[PDB]
């Protein structure tokens, strides 16, 4: 009986391949060839948020494009003030192992988590004047890799037990759980619509979920190695996933396959963080090769090298207004670039 | 600068607090602990669902010991967190090749190429009792020698040493009986050795 089911699954996969190939009339490159290239794009180190004493793992820009929160192995999640480099808060982490950060759209809550299997929600506007833990969400059997807020009330977390869940900070219970992944789910990115999201797992595949229905709506494949980053296009109809094979692809939700592949012969280190720009023309992707490349999202060719870090960059964040980009390396230095 | 002076004062205060915390925490020495299940990690933890952190102080050194064996996930995706560890403590149960494979995997990793691995052998008495009746060829078929504790232990030592490939790291093997209290002294001496080796490295002389 299991052999028949396996054969049916293989036939379904072949049907998926045939349907995906039948829709590929042309390529993105030969359509974008008629566009004027952006040319060389140069940006300088406007700011340098010194103060960290350990490796920086995340940096999420606030909804007002001024507040940036970063956590390190020192056990502190300092919420910086990007314009004047002032440090606003210093969150004391219960355990020094932190692997993710998040910032509320209203700025009230800051989320953190790591190997402790627990996603913590902090409160910034407490009446007592100090930061207090609002809720310690538990229920994951693996390390939390990336957490994002849909709003001030509900958080979605991607953990290392091949499962992404939608929490409820008010009650602290798993309202809805998404399952189906094979490997570690090491990335997550909520769409601008915020009704759906993706989670690029370690099995070289990124699955598109639905927040409300809680079912794997669509799936994508084509990567060679693990996926370490993912982020939606601003239009919400596409996303870019950064693999560990020194290449990052630009999938399309409607097409259901990779459109353009971003590879070049002089790159050997895997991606660590990939994020678009406000208009989506650029793709500021961090690298493990000591550098930080930015590519033209359409012509699929390099437009500049943002080499300014003494260690591997572990995060990348573009402000909602597009005025600056932040890269947090392992050299304990967070830099704001424009 | 209407009220931004107060903001600068708050920033300076919290920066001083972070600096003091960093200076206080820089005196501690971290030692990642690994090993098989029921391989003697617990007994040495006692002698002195997430990650388990154990801290003991000896001779004015704050030793931080992490038992990360409870992480039921891929080791590759989180092993970079312990890249800055001073030394790696390895525990092997001699009462029973999985530990050999784990040691081989952890020794040649890209993030542990310059950190020496301390190898601790537990359950020495149990192994000595078992070897008196069951030859060492049962666990390791390639062995060929007298059936006694003295040479079997040396053979196990040699085979564990043979799994390394980097010449910039050393393996400080010591044998424990799971009941002696001298383990802390051995760990402290090994840590001092590694620390002075790193200091000699920093001066461009070793």
């Amino acid at each position, epitope marked *: 009986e299991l052999d028949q089911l396996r054969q049916e699954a293989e036939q379904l996969k072949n049907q998926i391949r045939d349907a995906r190939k039948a829709c590929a009339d042309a390529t993105l490159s030969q359509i974008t060839n008629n566009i004027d290239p952006v040319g060389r794009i140069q940006m300088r180190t406007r700011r340098t948020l010194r103060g960290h004493l350990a490796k920086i793992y995340a940096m999420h820009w606030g909804t007002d494009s*001024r*507040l940036l929160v970063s956590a390190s192995q020192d056990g502190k999640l300092i919420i910086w*003030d990007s314009y004047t480099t*002032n440090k*606003v*808060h210093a969150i004391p982490l219960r355990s020094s192992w932190v692997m993710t950060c998040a910032y509320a759209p209203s*700025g009230n809550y800051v989320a953190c988590g790591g190997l402790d299997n627990i996603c913590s929600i902090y409160n910034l*506007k407490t*009446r*007592e*004047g*100090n930061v207090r833990v609002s809720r310690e969400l538990a229920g994951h059997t693996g390390y939390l890799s990336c957490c994002r807020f849909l709003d001030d009330n509900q958080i979605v977390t991607s953990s290392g037990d091949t499962t992404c869940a939608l929490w409820d900070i008010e009650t602290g219970q798993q309202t809805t759980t998404f399952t189906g992944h094979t490997g570690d789910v090491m990335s997550l990115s909520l769409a601008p619509d915020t009704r759906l999201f993706v989670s690029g797992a370690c099995d070289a595949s990124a699955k598109l979920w639905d927040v409300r229905e809680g079912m794997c709506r669509q799936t994508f494949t084509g990567h060679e190695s693990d996926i370490n980053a993912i982020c939606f296009f601003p239009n919400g109809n596409a996303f870019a996933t950064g693999s560990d094979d020194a290449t990052c692809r630009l999938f399309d939700l409607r097409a259901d396959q990779e459109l353009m592949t971003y590879s070049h012969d002089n790159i050997i280190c895997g991606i660590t963080s990939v994020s678009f720009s406000k208009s989506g023309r650029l793709l500021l992707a961090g690298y493990d090769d000591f550098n930080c490349n930015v590519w033209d999202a359409l012509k699929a060719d390099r437009a500049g090298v943002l080499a300014g870090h003494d260690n591997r960059v572990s995060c990348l964040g573009v402000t909602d207004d597009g005025m600056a980009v932040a890269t947090g390396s392992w050299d304990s230095f967070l830099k704001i670039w424009n | 600068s*209407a*009220e*931004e*002076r*107060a*903001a600068l*004062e*708050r920033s300076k*205060a919290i920066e001083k607090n972070l600096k003091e915390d960093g200076i206080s925490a820089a005196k501690d020495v971290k030692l990642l602990l690994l090993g098989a299940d029921n391989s003697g990690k617990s007994t040495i933890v006692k002698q002195m669902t997430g990650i388990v952190e154990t801290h003991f102080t000896f001779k004015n050194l704050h030793f931080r010991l992490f038992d990360v064996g409870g992480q039921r996930s891929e080791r590759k995706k989180w092993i970079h967190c312990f890249e800055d560890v001073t030394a790696i403590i390895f525990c092997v149960d001699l009462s029973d090749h999985e530990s050999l494979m784990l040691f081989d995997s952890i020794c040649n990793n890209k993030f542990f190429i310059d950190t020496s691995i301390i190898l601790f052998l537990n359950k020495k008495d149990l192994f000595g009792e078992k070897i008196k009746k069951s030859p060492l060829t049962i666990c390791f078929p390639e062995y060929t020698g007298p059936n006694t504790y003295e040479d079997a232990a040396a053979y196990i030592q040699a085979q564990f040493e043979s799994k390394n490939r980097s010449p910039n790291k050393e393996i400080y093997c010591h044998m424990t009986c799971a009941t002696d209290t001298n383990n802390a002294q051995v760990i402290f001496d090994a840590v001092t050795d590694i620390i002075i080796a790193n200091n000699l490295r920093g001066c461009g002389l070793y």
Partner: single-chain antibody
Amino acid sequence: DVQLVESGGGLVQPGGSRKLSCSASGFAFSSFGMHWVRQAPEKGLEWVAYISSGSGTIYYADTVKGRFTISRKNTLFLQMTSLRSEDTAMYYCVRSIYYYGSSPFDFWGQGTTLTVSGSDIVMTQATSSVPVTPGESVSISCRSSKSLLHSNGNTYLYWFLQRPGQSPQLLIYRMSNLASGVPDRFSGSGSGTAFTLTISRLEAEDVGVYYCMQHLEYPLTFGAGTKLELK
């Protein structure tokens, strides 16, 4: 939750010395800069002094420097020397934290009464008493000599309200934002020099006196006090 209690008043002969103690409980008082505000028996609020977190900086008013001393176990102290004839007032202990997006002067102490036997920025209130009926809209405006639009763009105009028999509470800070615990009816406006706090659908519990502050530079100055009486 948060509660500020202070004591140490009473009748004092002229030329004496007294100590006023501000006891803080229910919040992280170590990271807050406690101010000090007095109120004349029949006039508006006046400033005394300010001590920051960790006693990094301390300021005094024009006629207070040298005579008084402010120091802070979760307890704040104010030393008094050579009380004059006009030093009699009701003293308020005011808490305030300063960071980007913070709410300074958010809470005020209970207040203790006490009896005895030219280049600074000044703000004036055009009106003092304006009759108003419930359900209508009331507008209170105060002007400043120096424009408050600083370099960063934030205008430092605060609006304070005290109901009769009650300590003042913050209503609108920075002339645009709304303090927590304040209903949406209150709304601020104005830019540069003119300011106006507009109230829509007035309630019977909003009667009192309105004071507008500036925070551009010490010393802090208050308005004359616009009182909105019923009918």
